[PDB]
Symmetry: C2
Subunit: 497 residues, 2 copies
């Protein structure tokens, strides 16, 4: 089955309102930059972002010129003429609109509250989808928590019911309307809804993991923002999933959530697979088409794992643009982030950067010795390892943020497509390295084990193993005269064949 | 100034009941007349033991019991009330022999609490037995109900409480109400069976009498004190079974409440009870042993403490070798592994080769026989000074002990307990409680009082920040916290306002 390749197309309201395909100082990335070749390389384009208004319905930002919005969407849906499998999805949410302190956060919480609100919200999503010509709905709430999760789940279920009926009504069985969400790619935010992952994923075609932004100026130590595997020399983090309302014992939590651990792409994927009922085929790995930069770093390890003097707040609080050669940073007023397009140009500009590679994390980084700069980013080489991981782990595919950040020729997208589909690419001998893998085991993903059946009336010593009611259990202490189950003395360690 | 409870077990095997006499210790070692008026005044409760739960699922005497003899023995005990208007003669149902998992009547306990009808019939039989023989309350000693049986056990106790309170009104006993108590586990391993529902178990009781002894024994590989008040870092430590109880707490919560490994001591048991919300200190009674446990084959260097040994742990004693030199009662009872304080005192004053030593951390005595390689852990009037001070400082309900027949002829241990609680001329203000290890877990029931600024919606908090909300003080487990305590898993309750 073809791997999904989901690329975000993000355009701010002011660019839609002044949309033009002949002035990059107004619209840096017009839809006309997406050629038939690029369209064939994508399976989904996530148009972003729509929002939820105070009337608790899906809607465009009110300042949007509707005619111009339709025109932009039309340019994207016209790409389907070049690829019969391509879907132009629309995404509702994003950090700015939906974060806890975001401008529309209350609308997300309130829309999912009751059967009536969820029905009204769900119907609005399908109305918008049909009115503008989209092929599916993507929800990007960053992120629901606590009492909001059950409502969020019911909302997704309702949208799924409505989309499925719309597929039949429209005779779209060959290209059914889809439903996806962008999910947390790190344990801190993931802990908010982790316990109910199976219910969240059930109504979805895919859950697109935001496996990037795992490092940044807001952290005290420089690090790779999207390491595939861990580097013991790099920083480690508290495993927040140990605090999710799971109802597991101390041993169970400890075995499932080693801590401290390496915040990596592999960690997020494995944390999702640890939960029962989350299929690998629905998990999509996200990758960044941009890098993050730090200043005031020390040499020694190429700027890796160093203290730094980079402002961590937003917006960038200063007027000094210190990322040498990054003119894009000047225009966007932030020297802490840059598109791959720009980073690649900086590499061809003889500006003093050295491209280095970490063979444990399988990601590149730039080090500017002279000025004390470190940049963590991804490229066609790190994507070889990530694509092989997607294949080996049987994931659904890849997602990326965002199309406008690829170089002009679209090389990163072309690479992803090549690694999944080209007859002339062979990664059978690609060595995945010895970087740290996430090895937690959840009572939801126990290995097959074999042990003698439990015998009532028997007294068991510490560490004894027995099979009982479908699982293999181990004693945590001695003189056990109780049967396996809720009784504190027994630990579920495997599944009986 | 509420009087501390002093609860002594009066245990009498059936054959002694059937051959009861107060003029021939060869047949009845400890007859009721040995409880002089002076001793009766020092007790608040005598727990007559043991009754059982029969196949009919009702409280009952041992079938081989001569009922007329039993009634006469009981009447002799209730006659003691003539010397102490506060004295209650309770009866205890259970004990290890009848109710342990592999015990002869275990099935009856599990079955008696299964349904509303089985419970009503069982509860009714307890009150009937109480009234018919003239007892003043019901003590249940099931060792011990398991997780699946706990809810039934709780409901049974609530039923008995309801019937007892009705009987108190019907009998005009407002001045000395009928009581309900249980003997509770004094070590974490057995306590973990019902720990999660401690509050519910304790609600219908006047007292929960902790069996804070037998914390060392031949079933353990390392010799140790069986009732250390506080811990000795040089002694063995144990796995904290409570972290595996069915609490539903988070990793941080479980970890801070249940350090592991830990020192199995009397203080640990008491503090573990106080950590639960709804368990009042006034209902907690500290058990103490009037007997010592002996080990053979110990080595030197620590006076016999913390040594490997060659003592059989099975019951009955699997040999005919009575190796506890000087212990005549051990031959009588065919078991050299247990000796009454009465017998130990005689062995000490004899010239048998024992040396009495004192561990100033655990605040308990022990005997070491250098010639034969023997170790004995026991309690005496000196260890009782520290335990009585602890009962007062911690505002516990009182003390319980097993058993009356093991005190010396002058009743010195019972007299000591009464002295430490009630003598106008005893002063323990200067008694040094030592530097032994205290149990430092913190749970919902013993959060320290603290102050912190009120939580403010919309504020972002760093790692370690403290706020007050809903009457508790909370601290963040990581950074960039954007929601409220009780809704965001990043907050840990660490104090009480």
């Amino acid at each position: 089955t073809r791997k999904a390749v989901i690329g975000y197309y993000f355009i701010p309201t002011n660019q839609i309102n002044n949309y033009t395909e002949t002035d990059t100082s107004v619209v840096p990335f017009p839809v006309s930059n997406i050629t038939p070749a690029k369209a064939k390389q994508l399976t989904h384009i996530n148009f972003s972002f729509l929002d939820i208004n105070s009337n608790l319905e899906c809607a465009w930002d009110p300042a949007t010129n509707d005619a111009k919005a339709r025109d932009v969407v039309n340019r994207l849906t016209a790409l389907k003429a070049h690829n019969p499998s391509l879907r132009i999805m629309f995404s509702i949410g994003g950090w700015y609109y939906s974060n806890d302190l975001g401008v529309s956060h209350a609308n997300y919480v309130n829309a999912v509250k009751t059967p009536a609100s969820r029905a009204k919200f769900a119907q609005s999503c399908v109305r918008i989808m049909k009115d503008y010509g989209f092929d599916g709905v993507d929800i990007d709430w960053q992120y629901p928590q606590a009492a909001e999760v059950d409502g969020f789940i019911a909302a997704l279920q309702e949208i799924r019911t409505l989309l499925n009926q719309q597929t039949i009504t429209d005779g779209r069985q060959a290209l059914p309307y889809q439903l996806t969400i962008a999910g947390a790619g790190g344990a801190f935010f993931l802990s908010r809804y982790y316990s109910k992952l199976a219910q969240i994923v059930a109504p979805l075609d895919y859950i697109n993991l935001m496996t990037y932004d795992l490092a940044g100026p807001w952290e005290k130590v420089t690090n790779h923002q999207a390491a595939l595997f861990g580097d013991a020399a790099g920083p480690t983090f508290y495993n927040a999933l140990r605090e999710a309302n799971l109802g597991w014992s101390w041993e169970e939590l400890t075995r499932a959530f080693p801590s401290p651990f390496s915040l990596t792409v592999d960690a997020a994927v494995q944390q999702h697979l640890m939960m029962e009922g989350v299929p690998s085929a629905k998990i999509v790995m996200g990758v960044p088409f941009y890098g993050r930069a730090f200043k005031g770093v020390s040499g020694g390890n190429g700027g890796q794992y160093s203290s730094h003097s980079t402002p961590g707040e937003d917006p960038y609080p200063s007027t000094d643009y210190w990322l040498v050669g990054c003119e894009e940073c000047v225009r966007d007023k932030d020297p802490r982030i840059a598109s791959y397009r720009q980073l690649e140009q900086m590499l061809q500009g003889n500006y003093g950067y050295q491209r280095l590679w970490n063979d444990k994390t399988k990601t590149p980084y730039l080090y500017h010795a002279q000025n004390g700069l470190f940049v963590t980013y991804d490229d066609a080489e790190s994507f070889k390892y990530k694509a092989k991981y997607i294949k080996q782990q049987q994931l659904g595919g890849v997602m990326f943020w965002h199309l406008g950040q690829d170089n002009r020729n679209g090389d990163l997208l072309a690479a992803l497509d090549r690694y999944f589909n080209a007859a002339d690419y062979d990664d059978s001998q690609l060595d995945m390295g010895t970087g740290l893998r996430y090895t937690g085991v959840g009572p939801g993903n126990l290995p097959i084990m074999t042990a003698p059946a439990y015998v009532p009336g028997t007294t068991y010593a510490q560490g004894a193993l027995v099979s009982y009611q479908g699982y293999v259990w181990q004693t945590k202490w001695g003189y056990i005269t109780s049967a396996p189950g809720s009784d504190s003395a027994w630990l579920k360690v495997g599944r009986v064949a």
